[PDB]
Amino acid sequence: LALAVNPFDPTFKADPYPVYARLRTELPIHRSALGAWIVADYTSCDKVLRSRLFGKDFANSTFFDHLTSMMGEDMPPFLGLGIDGDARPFMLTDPPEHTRLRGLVSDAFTRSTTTSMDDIVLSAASSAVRHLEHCTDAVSEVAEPFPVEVLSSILGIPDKDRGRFSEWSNLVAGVLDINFAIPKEVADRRSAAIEESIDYFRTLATSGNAPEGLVRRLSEVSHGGDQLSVDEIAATCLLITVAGQETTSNTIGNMLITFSRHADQFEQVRANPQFIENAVAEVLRFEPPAHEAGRIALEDCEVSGANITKGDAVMVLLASGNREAVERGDTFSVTRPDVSSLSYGRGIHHCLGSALANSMLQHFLRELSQRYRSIEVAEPINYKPGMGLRGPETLSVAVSR
Numbered sequence: 001l002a003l004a005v006n007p008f009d010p011t012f013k014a015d016p017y018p019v020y021a022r023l024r025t026e027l028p029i030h031r032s033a034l035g036a037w038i039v040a041d042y043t044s045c046d047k048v049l050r051s052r053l054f055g056k057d058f059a060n061s062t063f064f065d066h067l068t069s070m071m072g073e074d075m076p077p078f079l080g081l082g083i084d085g086d087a088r089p090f091m092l093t094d095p096p097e098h099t100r101l102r103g104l105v106s107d108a109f110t111r112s113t114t115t116s117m118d119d120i121v122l123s124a125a126s127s128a129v130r131h132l133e134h135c136t137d138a139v140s141e142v143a144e145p146f147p148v149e150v151l152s153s154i155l156g157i158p159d160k161d162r163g164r165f166s167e168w169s170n171l172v173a174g175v176l177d178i179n180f181a182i183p184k185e186v187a188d189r190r191s192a193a194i195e196e197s198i199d200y201f202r203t204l205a206t207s208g209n210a211p212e213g214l215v216r217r218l219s220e221v222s223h224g225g226d227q228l229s230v231d232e233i234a235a236t237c238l239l240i241t242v243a244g245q246e247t248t249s250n251t252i253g254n255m256l257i258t259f260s261r262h263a264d265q266f267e268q269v270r271a272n273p274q275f276i277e278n279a280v281a282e283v284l285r286f287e288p289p290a291h292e293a294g295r296i297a298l299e300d301c302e303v304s305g306a307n308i309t310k311g312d313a314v315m316v317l318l319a320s321g322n323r324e325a326v327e328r329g330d331t332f333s334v335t336r337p338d339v340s341s342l343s344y345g346r347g348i349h350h351c352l353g354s355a356l357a358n359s360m361l362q363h364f365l366r367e368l369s370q371r372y373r374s375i376e377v378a379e380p381i382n383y384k385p386g387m388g389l390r391g392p393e394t395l396s397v398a399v400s401r
């Protein structure tokens, strides 16, 4: 009973795994009575992410009404409060809408993320890996600019707007997570940036020669007469700008913390470079940037003797499931000839950007291990606030050639 009260943030934040452990041995599923259900075991986690009895129409759910009443506080700007009720082009939706949007978007997205763009991912990774030896904070000087540079290039942001995009990208990044520890002027400041980047994205799309890249390809995509509207194109641009920022930056920070804590596993990478991909999957497993994915039951349901009611919110603990996805799951091992993970979700909503995040993370680690013999981060680590995401706020790293 005192286990439930334990998720979250009484510096459950700083280390949640032993508590995730308690959950799996004792209380695999429970009503949070903050509001939602909480799910901790690999098998049910997979099961719920995959099932067509669970969806993501979050704006039309009672969940935020409930959360807000419980918190006694107004919702901060959040992806999927959508824009004006319409959370749809944010993929916080179910078939047949999600199906239509996913198909059109992923067709353009892949064409903008092929091995032709690889050189610029490497360039961004190596610059960042290089910045690490003369930075004060690896979060704001290295992890956060790397995905901003990459996405700017994927999207075809013109040279002149790079400064504008990077500023927007900064205000919007926290709109991925829920955080009720956000003053007013900052909600506003962040709201303006949702509005201004949607304004800008429309205009770039309707205005022919957007450079080669995603904005332009989102315009050209056509599946037998079917095609994205211009508000769909701009909302998708924003979704992609938010989706790929803090997930990627948190993971760069967490990767760093993890090789600091396990110097031998790093040694393995620098000495065995054929394991670079397996190591990335392992970081993402051991320290995922998102500890939860969310679902809404579309139907009264049974998931392992638990009784879920139409319209209940279900919090899927990706971070917990992962710790039992492989044998000895509490050991960080980059040599796992395996790497089963929930960090990208499963089923129809499987992270669309996951080949790109993997590419980014792999080039980053490859440059990292080729450039440096050791990395050490100063302990203890301060983590960003928020409900579902986990990664460091600041980071001091010592590095050696």
Ligand code: HEM
Pocket: 049, 090, 091, 092, 102, 239, 240, 243, 244, 245, 247, 248, 249, 251, 284, 288, 289, 290, 292, 293, 294, 343, 344, 345, 346, 348, 349, 350, 351, 352, 353, 354, 356, 357
């Ligand atoms: C950095 C590592 C990343 C992780 C750990 C991550 C994780 C996620 C997770 C947990 C979801 C929810 C999946 C579910 O509900 O089952 C998601 C969805 C999504 N992600 Fe990411 N992501 C990452 C990087 C990216 C990047 C770089 C992009 C874009 C460039 C991206 C674009 C999206 C999109 C568009 C969706 C919605 C998919 C849908 O509903 O069909 N992801 N990803």
Ligand SMILES: CC(C)=C[C@H](O)C/C(C)=C/CC/C(C)=C/Cc1c(C)[nH]c2ccccc2c1=O
Pocket: 058, 080, 090, 091, 092, 176, 177, 178, 239, 243, 247, 290, 292, 293, 294, 295, 387, 388, 389
């Ligand atoms: C998934 C979801 C809507 C969860 C809850 O409603 C709110 C919550 C506590 C979120 C924390 C982080 C979060 C939104 C995680 C899953 C997820 C990620 C990582 N990226 C996305 C990108 C685009 C669209 C949806 C998601 C998503 O749901």
